[PDB]
Design a binder for this molecule. Structure first.
Ligand SMILES: Cc1cn([C@H]2C[C@H](OP(=O)(O)O)[C@@H](COP(=O)(O)O)O2)c(=O)[nH]c1=O
Ligand SMILES: [Ca+2]
Length: 129
């Protein structure tokens, strides 16, 4: 997989963000994770966590997986990095997202993220409390 440049346009919620990618605005949905909707428990915390992470980043990158790059809503599907740290993994390690939506062919970082979820559950963090 390869990291590509993007710039922040605006935080949306725990697992979606609007970025400018190859010069075009697009909403990205983070691969392999599910945050609670803003209206649910830990929803506000997840949105705040991603917002801080993406707004504080000096360099944002997106990394597509091997499979579909857009979903049925026209959202980009990617791993997102903020100054070299993967947002997808960081949300799971913090118990602010569950590993979810694992579809054959877009699952390169599945085992990395499961490993993060195990540690978050071990620690009873957030969703796992
Ligand atoms: C993460 C992800 C979501 N989706 C679709 C599945 C779900 O369809 P439905 O909307 O029909 O439930 C929806 C979940 O996204 P959200 O969690 O953002 O709602 O997005 C994909 O198709 N591929 C993916 O990799
Ligand atoms: Ca969600």
């Amino acid at each position: 997989l390869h990291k590509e440049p993007a710039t922040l346009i605006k935080a949306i919620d725990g697992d979606t963000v609007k970025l400018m990618y190859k010069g075009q605005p697009m909403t990205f949905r983070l691969l392999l994770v599910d945050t609670p909707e803003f209206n649910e428990k830990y929803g506000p915390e997840a949105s705040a966590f991603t917002k801080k992470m993406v707004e504080n980043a000096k360099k944002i990158e997106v990394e597509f997986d091997k499979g579909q790059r857009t979903d049925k809503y026209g959202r980009g599907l990617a791993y997102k990095y903020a100054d070299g740290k993967m947002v997808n993994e960081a949300l799971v390690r913090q118990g602010l997202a569950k590993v979810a939506y694992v579809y054959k062919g877009n699952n390169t970082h599945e085992q990395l993220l499961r490993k993060a979820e195990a540690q978050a559950k071990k620690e009873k963090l957030n969703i796992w409390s």
